[PDB]
Ligand binder design. Sequence first.
Ligand SMILES: [Mg+2]
Ligand SMILES: [Mg+2]
Ligand SMILES: [Mg+2]
Ligand SMILES: [Mg+2]
Ligand SMILES: [Mg+2]
Ligand SMILES: [Mg+2]
Ligand SMILES: [Mg+2]
Ligand SMILES: [Mg+2]
Ligand SMILES: [Mg+2]
Ligand SMILES: [Mg+2]
Ligand SMILES: [Mg+2]
Ligand SMILES: [Mg+2]
Ligand SMILES: [Mg+2]
Ligand SMILES: [Mg+2]
Ligand SMILES: [Mg+2]
Ligand SMILES: [Mg+2]
Ligand SMILES: [Mg+2]
Ligand SMILES: [Mg+2]
Ligand SMILES: [Mg+2]
Ligand SMILES: [Mg+2]
Ligand SMILES: [Mg+2]
Ligand SMILES: [Mg+2]
Ligand SMILES: [Mg+2]
Ligand SMILES: [Mg+2]
Ligand SMILES: [Mg+2]
Ligand SMILES: [Mg+2]
Ligand SMILES: [Mg+2]
Ligand SMILES: [Mg+2]
Ligand SMILES: [Mg+2]
Ligand SMILES: [Mg+2]
Ligand SMILES: [Mg+2]
Ligand SMILES: [Mg+2]
Ligand SMILES: [Mg+2]
Ligand SMILES: [Mg+2]
Ligand SMILES: [Mg+2]
Ligand SMILES: [Mg+2]
Ligand SMILES: [Mg+2]
Ligand SMILES: [Mg+2]
Ligand SMILES: [Mg+2]
Lengths: 102, 349, 319
Amino acid sequence: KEIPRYENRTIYGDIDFRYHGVKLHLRSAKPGFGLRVNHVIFEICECAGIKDLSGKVYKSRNDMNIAKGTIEAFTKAQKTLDEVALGRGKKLVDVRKVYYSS
Amino acid sequence: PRKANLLKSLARGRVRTSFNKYNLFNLYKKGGVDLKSKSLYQQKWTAKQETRAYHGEHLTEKRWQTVFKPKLDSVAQLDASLRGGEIKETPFLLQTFAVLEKRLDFALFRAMFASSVRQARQFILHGNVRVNGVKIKHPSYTLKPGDMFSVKPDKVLEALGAKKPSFQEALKIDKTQIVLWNKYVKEAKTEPKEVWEKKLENFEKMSDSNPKKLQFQEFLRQYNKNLESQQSLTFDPKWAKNLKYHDPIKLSELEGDEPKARKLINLPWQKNYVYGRQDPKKPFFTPWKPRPFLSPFAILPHHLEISFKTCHAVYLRDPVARPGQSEVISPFDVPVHERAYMYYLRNGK
Amino acid sequence: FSRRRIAYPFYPFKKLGRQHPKKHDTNLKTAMRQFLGPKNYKGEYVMNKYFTVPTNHVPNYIKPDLERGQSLEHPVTKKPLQLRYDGTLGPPPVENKRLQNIFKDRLLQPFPSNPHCKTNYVLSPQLKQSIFEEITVEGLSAQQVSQKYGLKIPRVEAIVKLVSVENSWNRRNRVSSDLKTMDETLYRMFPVFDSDASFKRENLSEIPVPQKTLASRFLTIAESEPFGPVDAAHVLELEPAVETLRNLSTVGEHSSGHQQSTNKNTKVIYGELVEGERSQYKFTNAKVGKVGYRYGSGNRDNKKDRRIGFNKLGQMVYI
RNA sequence: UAUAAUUAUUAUAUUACAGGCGUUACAUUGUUGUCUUUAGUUCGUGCUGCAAAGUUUUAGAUUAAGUUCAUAAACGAACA
RNA sequence: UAUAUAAAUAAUAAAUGAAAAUGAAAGUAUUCCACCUGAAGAGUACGUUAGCAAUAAUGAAACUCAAAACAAUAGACG
RNA sequence: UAGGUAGUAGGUUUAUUAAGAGUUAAACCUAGCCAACGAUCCAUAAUCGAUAAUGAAAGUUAGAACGAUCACGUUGACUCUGAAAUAUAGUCAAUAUCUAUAAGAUACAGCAGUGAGGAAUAUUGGACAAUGAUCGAAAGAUUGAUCCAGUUACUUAUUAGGAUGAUAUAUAAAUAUAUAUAUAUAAAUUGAUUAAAAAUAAAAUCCAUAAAUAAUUAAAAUAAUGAUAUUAAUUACCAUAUAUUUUUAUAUGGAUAUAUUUUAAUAGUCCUGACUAAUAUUUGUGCCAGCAGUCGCGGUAACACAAAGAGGGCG
Ligand SMILES: [Mg+2]
Ligand SMILES: [Mg+2]
Ligand SMILES: [Mg+2]
Ligand SMILES: [Mg+2]
Ligand SMILES: [Mg+2]
Ligand SMILES: [Mg+2]
Ligand SMILES: [Mg+2]
Ligand SMILES: [Mg+2]
Ligand SMILES: [Mg+2]
Ligand SMILES: [Mg+2]
Ligand SMILES: [Mg+2]
Ligand SMILES: [Mg+2]
Ligand SMILES: [Mg+2]
Ligand SMILES: [Mg+2]
Ligand SMILES: [Mg+2]
Ligand SMILES: [Mg+2]
Ligand SMILES: [Mg+2]
Ligand SMILES: [Mg+2]
Ligand SMILES: [Mg+2]
Ligand SMILES: [Mg+2]
Ligand SMILES: [Mg+2]
Ligand SMILES: [Mg+2]
Ligand SMILES: [Mg+2]
Ligand SMILES: [Mg+2]
Ligand SMILES: [Mg+2]
Ligand SMILES: [Mg+2]
Ligand SMILES: [Mg+2]
Ligand SMILES: [Mg+2]
Ligand SMILES: [Mg+2]
Ligand SMILES: [Mg+2]
Ligand SMILES: [Mg+2]
Ligand SMILES: [Mg+2]
Ligand SMILES: [Mg+2]
Ligand SMILES: [Mg+2]
Ligand SMILES: [Mg+2]
Ligand SMILES: [Mg+2]
Ligand SMILES: [Mg+2]
Ligand SMILES: [Mg+2]
Ligand SMILES: [Mg+2]
């Protein structure tokens, strides 16, 4: 599949998606934060290219369900900035990127 | 600190902040750090082993954990947009072991004043260093931007110079040197033609590698072809007779007396001074020469500026992490430091 | 799957087999012997290509991956040698193409497994002397020197201070031949810094990242609405990045627009000194509530974070 | 082979065991009886379920027979 | 006796769910009340209250253990 | 613990105090007051911080140590001084001990120390030199407050050696500068016959420092006063003159025949089936001896018991 990443580093915003019995609470991270997440999610991220993340798993902690849930969450739970702007008719600006611009 | 117990063991293969030949070979054969087929704890453990082996070997883990600072330092370039091209990712987590670089021990080692951080520690504790003109005996002294520190020049020459051979080692080396020189002259005198032609053949292929090219040219032009030419590196038979055999070395009477044994040695490349101990008063190999296996470890840090003319350095700033380059010098790739960083964040939980 | 693995070289090497019971050798030891080569009567491993030190301003770092572990070369011919069946050494049957062409980045990289570490450039003595003169003799600003030569302001200040030390050590005629040999040897060990070349020049547009700019923020505004760096500064409540770059350009000692006269408005009284007194007193005004030692403060003497400092003479003092 | 040498056997000893239809088919190899001339037992790729699994190996019929058709996530294959 | 609106029933989409399944809810939300925090001890002992009585309400702790429990799958068995 | 309260809730006056107030004493009324968001009663506890521990944080714990507040000085009540005492006063009551046998004295919750209790917590130490406190016009006197030292690894920090290092012999005609020195002899500890090591580990070599002895010897304190104290620190000859981040050199007078004292380095403890880092194998017992935080291991394959080799943490 294809996973959208914010600056090829982290997810867009926070995710609170539920897979069957697994409650995935994932939140974005600062540059250079590191993967401070459960080992299953850490492996999925390291293979998918995510470098900074933070989250906690609630209710069931079955490894396989966690892996399926996190892949799905990346795929559909999150939404890119461009898609939000287009469907909204508004402009979303990254303050960090525009502060360091020319 | 921790006692040096099997620092340079081959089986473990750990790389240390040292110029030692065994350490160099371990670095040579390490072939990266294996992290496949390991549970996340095992990967974290291997990373801590390797990083702690290199960075802060002498620091106790409790001290290191207290010193370890979660917040890392990085620099952002405004001119990135001016170039208008793809930018290299910033290696943020290569600055995990950057706190140790303020210490005077690491500062000396990076500045190529001591062969090892342990040697830097001993230099500091023995009163051979001065920070801003104040002599500091404590290795753990932390430095500030714009600071100066100096080391006694003799100590630096000892660190970066070859080991001084003992009396009997030098005497043996001289005896065998005379033995081989006598062979060279005898073979030159017996069949001068073949010796000269092979000497010229060696002269031809030199690849700007040794300084004997200009010596040999001066040798020839000193007495051969002062004004004549050939249509020059020409053969002469006089030098064969001019060569004189050197007297042998008893090695049993000359022992126990350096001045007496030193008057007999008259080698063309070593006159009136035994091998290595030209001036025994100095602690290093006199005349001074770089120590063996110095090339792979000679690195110029960016956070320090060094003047070997006077063994003075300036602490420009703390190491930083620019796009595509990290100022912390380490033989471990970014993932290893990532695993180590996430081990120490939770105290190894 | 974790197991203890002896750090055998990844590259192939001859492994000892049927051996005399009174040898007591190990595969690691023979690997080192193969890598180093013969040790002569002088204790020098001449064959190993890393025994010597480069004199051509190109660092000679380890390339185990590219040379497949063949570290032996003729000292003069500088051509590869490998062990044969007979136990002697000689040219390899084929030439290693990877060693033939090496990228400049790999040349400057000392450690094979870390491509983020590079060795800085040694500035020529002429460049240091020119910087010294321009700062002192010509009375220019270190900002100008940094801009022309591409160095940082801390670097140029370090250059001038070290050159002053060198001059002092020189007019005392203290520098011996050994130090000159050391400098000559190490000078040819690292590349020289060419101010003309752009890719050697160091970037001068570097800013420390404030904690707040590292935190992501997002605003939803009319698409037409233009958003610029200054608006980002307002919403992030930070000084504009260009302005911060300008500010740090003036913090240099010799840089333009520098002044440190802020602490010149405190009432300080020096007590009178009479004969025989071994000390003098300075009295500095300090407002009540802002001066003195707190009552009931924390006692970290017996804790892991105890404060340890140094005095003027350098003695370790429990601050 | 040229009275000798070598070899093979025999006899007498001894360390040394050999020997056992003694126990254990509830330790076994091999073989055999009954279910049994009974029609069952499994694998590769695909698909379904988060998964153990399932499918194929079946609605309905036919055959001595998962034999052969009809529909069907199934398409084939192996021991029968 | 075709057309529209309400209610019940039965089968479902989406959703929820550990699944079986629910499907004007066991879905999307809001408000209020009651109850649960491993098994065994135990709704037991003691106290109190009320009843003619059988009893009803309230209701512990000590000892022991890494158990205990639901849905569904594949066999074996009847 | 389901009802509690009876000066109890309130009103009016008088009395003491500087003062309001059923706070206390006296008189007359009203019939109230608390209570299932927990009264009354019972048990427990000294309380808190800009203090200590922990966590991402809200929080949770301790109340040792620094500081703040309260109560007590064997137990209970009362009284004079004062603005303030139910005072470590006194009286009285109670308890235990002692000698002087008396309306007698003491009560180590002041310092040091002793017996008991306990798994467990120190010297019957030096000085008022510094900061305070008391008396005195002052000189000064006292100060177990306080400052120091001793026991204790209870806690924290620093130090507790760097570089080099896999063998020793014998041979090598009798200064244009060479060089990949090359041959024979002997030995080679534990495990093993190669990815099975112990092991640069050891020995040996080069160079330092600690400690000792010599000189200076500040500063805590000045007018003088130093318990700590055999002070820390510096020089390894002392000091004067010159250049000068410091450092160092130049060179003069004081003692020697072209120097200027000596000099090293012996870590314990836990674990190696998984959670959990630790593959180099071998021996003993055989559901016994035993191990174990959880799963569990041991009845002849024990990676788990007891050990050797090797290894992994903390130090
Ligand atoms: Mg799991
Ligand atoms: Mg393991
Ligand atoms: Mg038998
Ligand atoms: Mg029989
Ligand atoms: Mg049978
Ligand atoms: Mg059988
Ligand atoms: Mg699936
Ligand atoms: Mg069937
Ligand atoms: Mg559905
Ligand atoms: Mg729900
Ligand atoms: Mg439910
Ligand atoms: Mg009942
Ligand atoms: Mg059990
Ligand atoms: Mg069931
Ligand atoms: Mg059946
Ligand atoms: Mg009144
Ligand atoms: Mg009253
Ligand atoms: Mg009354
Ligand atoms: Mg109550
Ligand atoms: Mg109490
Ligand atoms: Mg509290
Ligand atoms: Mg409390
Ligand atoms: Mg207290
Ligand atoms: Mg009292
Ligand atoms: Mg008492
Ligand atoms: Mg009282
Ligand atoms: Mg009394
Ligand atoms: Mg006492
Ligand atoms: Mg104790
Ligand atoms: Mg006093
Ligand atoms: Mg400690
Ligand atoms: Mg043996
Ligand atoms: Mg000393
Ligand atoms: Mg044990
Ligand atoms: Mg056994
Ligand atoms: Mg165990
Ligand atoms: Mg054992
Ligand atoms: Mg052992
Ligand atoms: Mg150990």
